[PDB]
Each structure stands twice: as structure tokens, then as C-alpha cells.
């Protein structure tokens, strides 16, 4: 026989080396490995939403640094553009590869 009954380790996640360069107006293939969501193909997910999102968060996150920023103070401000469910999706990758809020103990990775 077997037995497992382990676990406490990462979930197919990992902190960022290094703060990346990203394009408001561009989507290269690292942004889309991370929101292919967006780029399936369906008729409430579309390609242009994605971005609308993005650079908002993108710009916030700046408009505070090098304070952190939190998703609460974006969520509210494009509840019209998709959901909740999509909103954390692309805040917390975009903290993730570090483009937004790079190295500091306020991020969801270190956490």
C-alpha cells in the first residue's frame, strides 16, 4: 500500500528575480501565458478588456510606488470592466513577474 498526508509548499507559484519591462500597448506571449483567458477565444472574454484593466492597474501601480498597491483601490474603479474574478487574475500575475509592486512584503507571493 501507500499514503501521502503531505503538502505546505508552493501552488505553481513563484516570486518574480527581478522587475520585468511591460507594454501598455503591446501583448507579448509572457503577458498571454499568463492571461490566455483572455486570448481563448470566448464572447465574454476578449483581448481588448484585458487591456483596458491592465493599463489601469499598470498606472495605479506606479501613481503609489514605490508604495505597494493594493487590488481594493482598483477594484472598485474598473467594476465595470469585467469582474472581481478577472481583476485579481491580472493584478496579482502582473505582481507576480514583478512588472508591479517589485520586491517588498506586501505582494501575494511572498505571503
Known sequence: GSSGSSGHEEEELKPPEQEIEIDRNIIQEEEKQAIPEFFEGRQAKTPERYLKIRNYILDQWEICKPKYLNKTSVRPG????????CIGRIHTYLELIGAINFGCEQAVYNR
Open 78 to 85: 474598473l467594476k465595470n470592466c469585467g469582474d472581481v474574478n
